[PDB]
């Protein structure tokens, strides 16, 4: 059959230009007399129609989104791209490039939705701090240790333990807004207290939007 | 100025029949084709019915649509509810060279075992202190019901400034997990003798303490 | 209440938890097939629309 | 079994232990008002007639 794949960055700064490109594999853009369209959907809201295009220069736009949508089709690379201007914080939506034949009909095949949350012009790297276990950090035969992911922007961050070797007892918590803009969370794993000084635990915090990968070793607290 | 009016919430028991409406304001529903979309949370939408009376190949016979042009309301009759049917429903129109979607209707059915709120604490690290920062992390895990209250304590003194906590979230072992963070300055960390986090759950209180050592 | 044998007079209260015949089954006038009491429970929820 | 929701096809078995509803009101499948347990014990006795 045929499939649709989107690309482009998952971020955009306020008052900037969005560049999302949707590619076609298993078919031809020009053949079949086939139209092309883009649809966005905010989280928790209904679907919103952005615009539709033909393989020629024919196009149409939502009057709410008029004079802001620029979509072009290149047949040589067999893909189509949309350019959005004057993006705001209210444009945070899951964008779907929509394969659709009948202009009054349906979007018979849907591509996977890329998450593009418009940043607040404050993208920055994370600050990873170790969480040293101690005698007061254990309750019984098991102990807890983790890493603190603080002062990062924007969502999300992926935290893995020992490059994904440790999964049992690993809890990933949702982030919360701090007092001033930034986010913070943590990821911890529960281990027996016997393997504290004999096993090395390293957390792998990845921040793709800021292009920062931080590996922080977790050790028991050294009293000074 | 043509829009599709769709009910926000529709909920019925499984096994019965339901009716989902899609009402047009200005343009008549008989003017243009109406397409219904059934979308999983965190997944691409899928067309459940099209051309207002006929079905796509793949969906069961229960997804039936009807058109009532007198009241300008498009109806989608769904019978014999199951588990997989709990999803968003959107109706589509065209107006005139401007595709208009619907408001959205989702179905919600309206189960965890009780547990003990294990709480652990950590002091701020030396690396964080070298960055002129300090944060006390309070963690609540493996508990049910997911309704906990956090209250930081300094030297026998409640702390509210810089307190950030997370809503309880489901774990893999069917329990809840929660967090609490206390942003603090390095000199205030050593000002008090001890810092403690108290967690109240179902009346019982679990308290741990940390000290600068 | 969901069911009734026939119409009822205005300003009249019915508290009958007696068998209603949707078709025709005596069923000892207590319970069985095609004979249910008319009372029905609600579906209230604070998170409704 | 003394109580049943609907008429049953020939050549089958009924093992369902759900609380039959004597009334249309659900009881969360419990022995409450307008809803009674459809299975009953016998009254066998060696000194019967």
UniProtKB/Swiss-Prot annotation, chains C, D:
Impact after mutating residue 25 to K: In strain: Delta/B.1.617.2, Omicron/BA.1, Omicron/BA.2, Omicron/BA.2.12.1, Omicron/BA.2.75, Omicron/BA.4, Omicron/BA.5, Omicron/BQ.1.1, Omicron/XBB.1.5, Omicron/EG.5.1
Q: What is the effect of changing residue 31 to K?
A: In strain: Beta/B.1.351, Eta/B.1.525, Theta/P.3, Iota/B.1.526, B.1.1.318, Gamma/P.1, Zeta/P.2 and Mu/B.1.621; May enhance affinity to human ACE2 receptor
Disulfide bond entries:
27-35
Region of interest (Disordered), residue spans = 2-37
The subunit structure is: Binds to host ACE2. RBD also interacts with the N-linked glycan on 'Asn-90' of ACE2. Cleavage of S generates a polybasic C-terminal sequence on S1 that binds to host Neuropilin-1 (NRP1) and Neuropilin-2 (NRP2) receptors. Interacts with host integrin alpha-5/beta-1 (ITGA5:ITGB1) and with ACE2 in complex with integrin alpha-5/beta-1 (ITGA5:ITGB1). May interact via cytoplasmic c-terminus with M protein. May interact (via N-terminus) with host bilirubin and biliverdin, thereby preventing antibody binding to the SARS-CoV-2 spike NTD via an allosteric mechanism.
Q: What does this protein do?
A: Attaches the virion to the cell membrane by interacting with host receptor, initiating the infection. The major receptor is host ACE2. When S2/S2' has been cleaved, binding to the receptor triggers direct fusion at the cell membrane. When S2/S2' has not been cleaved, binding to the receptor results in internalization of the virus by endocytosis using host TFRC and GRM2 and leading to fusion of the virion membrane with the host endosomal membrane. Alternatively, may use NRP1/NRP2 and integrin as entry receptors.
Q: What is this protein called?
A: Spike protein S1
Q: Which residues of the whole protein are included?
A: 454 to 502 of 1273
